[PDB]
PDB file of all heavy atoms in Angstrom:
ATOM      1  N   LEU D  52      48.259  75.484 -12.268  1.00  0.00           N
ATOM      2  CA  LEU D  52      48.994  74.555 -13.118  1.00  0.00           C
ATOM      3  C   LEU D  52      50.293  74.073 -12.484  1.00  0.00           C
ATOM      4  O   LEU D  52      50.384  72.912 -12.071  1.00  0.00           O
ATOM      5  CB  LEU D  52      49.295  75.199 -14.473  1.00  0.00           C
ATOM      6  CG  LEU D  52      48.097  75.630 -15.320  1.00  0.00           C
ATOM      7  CD1 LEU D  52      48.557  76.149 -16.673  1.00  0.00           C
ATOM      8  CD2 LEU D  52      47.116  74.481 -15.486  1.00  0.00           C
ATOM      9  N   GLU D  53      51.299  74.962 -12.396  1.00  0.00           N
ATOM     10  CA  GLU D  53      52.676  74.664 -11.998  1.00  0.00           C
ATOM     11  C   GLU D  53      53.347  73.855 -13.111  1.00  0.00           C
ATOM     12  O   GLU D  53      52.658  73.133 -13.844  1.00  0.00           O
ATOM     13  CB  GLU D  53      52.695  73.924 -10.652  1.00  0.00           C
ATOM     14  CG  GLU D  53      54.061  73.627 -10.054  1.00  0.00           C
ATOM     15  CD  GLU D  53      53.972  72.979  -8.687  1.00  0.00           C
ATOM     16  OE1 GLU D  53      52.841  72.732  -8.218  1.00  0.00           O
ATOM     17  OE2 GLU D  53      55.033  72.721  -8.079  1.00  0.00           O
ATOM     18  N   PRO D  54      54.675  73.950 -13.291  1.00  0.00           N
ATOM     19  CA  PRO D  54      55.319  73.184 -14.370  1.00  0.00           C
ATOM     20  C   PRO D  54      55.275  71.678 -14.164  1.00  0.00           C
ATOM     21  O   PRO D  54      54.751  71.193 -13.157  1.00  0.00           O
ATOM     22  CB  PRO D  54      56.763  73.709 -14.364  1.00  0.00           C
ATOM     23  CG  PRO D  54      56.932  74.390 -13.038  1.00  0.00           C
ATOM     24  CD  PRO D  54      55.587  74.962 -12.732  1.00  0.00           C
ATOM     25  N   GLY D  55      55.830  70.929 -15.122  1.00  0.00           N
ATOM     26  CA  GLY D  55      55.734  69.485 -15.139  1.00  0.00           C
ATOM     27  C   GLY D  55      54.366  68.941 -15.478  1.00  0.00           C
ATOM     28  O   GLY D  55      54.178  67.718 -15.474  1.00  0.00           O
ATOM     29  N   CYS D  56      53.408  69.811 -15.785  1.00  0.00           N
ATOM     30  CA  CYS D  56      52.032  69.409 -16.032  1.00  0.00           C
ATOM     31  C   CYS D  56      51.850  68.737 -17.389  1.00  0.00           C
ATOM     32  O   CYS D  56      52.706  68.814 -18.276  1.00  0.00           O
ATOM     33  CB  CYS D  56      51.096  70.610 -15.930  1.00  0.00           C
ATOM     34  SG  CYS D  56      50.448  70.888 -14.276  1.00  0.00           S
ATOM     35  N   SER D  57      50.706  68.071 -17.528  1.00  0.00           N
ATOM     36  CA  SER D  57      50.289  67.370 -18.735  1.00  0.00           C
ATOM     37  C   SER D  57      49.558  68.285 -19.712  1.00  0.00           C
ATOM     38  O   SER D  57      48.924  67.792 -20.650  1.00  0.00           O
ATOM     39  CB  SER D  57      49.414  66.171 -18.373  1.00  0.00           C
ATOM     40  OG  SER D  57      49.184  65.347 -19.505  1.00  0.00           O
ATOM     41  N   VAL D  58      49.602  69.601 -19.481  1.00  0.00           N
ATOM     42  CA  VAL D  58      48.789  70.596 -20.181  1.00  0.00           C
ATOM     43  C   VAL D  58      48.818  70.401 -21.695  1.00  0.00           C
ATOM     44  O   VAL D  58      49.858  70.077 -22.280  1.00  0.00           O
ATOM     45  CB  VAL D  58      49.249  72.023 -19.818  1.00  0.00           C
ATOM     46  CG1 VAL D  58      49.126  72.259 -18.328  1.00  0.00           C
ATOM     47  CG2 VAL D  58      50.686  72.257 -20.268  1.00  0.00           C
ATOM     48  N   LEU D  59      47.657  70.574 -22.325  1.00  0.00           N
ATOM     49  CA  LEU D  59      47.504  70.298 -23.747  1.00  0.00           C
ATOM     50  C   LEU D  59      48.167  71.380 -24.593  1.00  0.00           C
ATOM     51  O   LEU D  59      48.437  72.489 -24.126  1.00  0.00           O
ATOM     52  CB  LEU D  59      46.021  70.200 -24.111  1.00  0.00           C
ATOM     53  CG  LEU D  59      45.111  69.397 -23.180  1.00  0.00           C
ATOM     54  CD1 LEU D  59      43.681  69.407 -23.697  1.00  0.00           C
ATOM     55  CD2 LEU D  59      45.614  67.975 -23.013  1.00  0.00           C
ATOM     56  N   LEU D  60      48.436  71.041 -25.853  1.00  0.00           N
ATOM     57  CA  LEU D  60      48.934  71.981 -26.854  1.00  0.00           C
ATOM     58  C   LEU D  60      48.097  71.825 -28.117  1.00  0.00           C
ATOM     59  O   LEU D  60      48.103  70.757 -28.738  1.00  0.00           O
ATOM     60  CB  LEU D  60      50.416  71.748 -27.155  1.00  0.00           C
ATOM     61  CG  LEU D  60      51.479  72.535 -26.384  1.00  0.00           C
ATOM     62  CD1 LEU D  60      51.541  72.121 -24.926  1.00  0.00           C
ATOM     63  CD2 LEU D  60      52.837  72.367 -27.052  1.00  0.00           C
ATOM     64  N   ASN D  61      47.385  72.880 -28.500  1.00  0.00           N
ATOM     65  CA  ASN D  61      46.582  72.835 -29.714  1.00  0.00           C
ATOM     66  C   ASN D  61      47.484  72.708 -30.935  1.00  0.00           C
ATOM     67  O   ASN D  61      48.604  73.227 -30.949  1.00  0.00           O
ATOM     68  CB  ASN D  61      45.711  74.086 -29.831  1.00  0.00           C
ATOM     69  CG  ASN D  61      44.708  74.209 -28.700  1.00  0.00           C
ATOM     70  OD1 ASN D  61      44.347  73.219 -28.063  1.00  0.00           O
ATOM     71  ND2 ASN D  61      44.247  75.429 -28.450  1.00  0.00           N
ATOM     72  N   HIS D  62      46.998  72.003 -31.963  1.00  0.00           N
ATOM     73  CA  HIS D  62      47.772  71.873 -33.193  1.00  0.00           C
ATOM     74  C   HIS D  62      47.982  73.218 -33.873  1.00  0.00           C
ATOM     75  O   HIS D  62      49.074  73.490 -34.385  1.00  0.00           O
ATOM     76  CB  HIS D  62      47.091  70.901 -34.160  1.00  0.00           C
ATOM     77  CG  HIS D  62      47.443  69.465 -33.924  1.00  0.00           C
ATOM     78  ND1 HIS D  62      48.747  69.020 -33.870  1.00  0.00           N
ATOM     79  CD2 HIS D  62      46.665  68.368 -33.764  1.00  0.00           C
ATOM     80  CE1 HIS D  62      48.756  67.715 -33.665  1.00  0.00           C
ATOM     81  NE2 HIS D  62      47.506  67.294 -33.598  1.00  0.00           N
ATOM     82  N   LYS D  63      46.961  74.068 -33.897  1.00  0.00           N
ATOM     83  CA  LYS D  63      47.102  75.364 -34.543  1.00  0.00           C
ATOM     84  C   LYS D  63      46.883  76.542 -33.593  1.00  0.00           C
ATOM     85  O   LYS D  63      45.757  76.812 -33.176  1.00  0.00           O
ATOM     86  CB  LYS D  63      46.130  75.470 -35.722  1.00  0.00           C
ATOM     87  CG  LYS D  63      46.365  74.443 -36.819  1.00  0.00           C
ATOM     88  CD  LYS D  63      47.712  74.659 -37.490  1.00  0.00           C
ATOM     89  CE  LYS D  63      47.983  73.597 -38.546  1.00  0.00           C
ATOM     90  NZ  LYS D  63      48.176  72.249 -37.945  1.00  0.00           N
ATOM     91  N   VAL D  64      47.969  77.238 -33.261  1.00  0.00           N
ATOM     92  CA  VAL D  64      49.312  76.714 -33.495  1.00  0.00           C
ATOM     93  C   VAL D  64      50.065  76.667 -32.166  1.00  0.00           C
ATOM     94  O   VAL D  64      50.439  77.711 -31.630  1.00  0.00           O
ATOM     95  CB  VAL D  64      50.090  77.555 -34.534  1.00  0.00           C
ATOM     96  CG1 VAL D  64      51.325  76.802 -35.009  1.00  0.00           C
ATOM     97  CG2 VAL D  64      49.196  77.943 -35.710  1.00  0.00           C
ATOM     98  N   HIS D  65      50.299  75.455 -31.653  1.00  0.00           N
ATOM     99  CA  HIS D  65      51.042  75.239 -30.404  1.00  0.00           C
ATOM    100  C   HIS D  65      50.531  76.123 -29.265  1.00  0.00           C
ATOM    101  O   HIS D  65      51.296  76.867 -28.648  1.00  0.00           O
ATOM    102  CB  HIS D  65      52.545  75.446 -30.612  1.00  0.00           C
ATOM    103  CG  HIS D  65      53.191  74.388 -31.449  1.00  0.00           C
ATOM    104  ND1 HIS D  65      53.360  73.093 -31.009  1.00  0.00           N
ATOM    105  CD2 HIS D  65      53.719  74.431 -32.695  1.00  0.00           C
ATOM    106  CE1 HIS D  65      53.959  72.382 -31.949  1.00  0.00           C
ATOM    107  NE2 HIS D  65      54.188  73.173 -32.982  1.00  0.00           N
TER     108      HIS D  65
END
Side-chain angles (χ1 to χ4, degrees):
Chain D
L52 299 184
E53 184 176 2
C56 270
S57 190
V58 300
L59 316 180
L60 267 69
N61 297 337
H62 274 306
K63 298 295 177 292
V64 194
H65 291 290

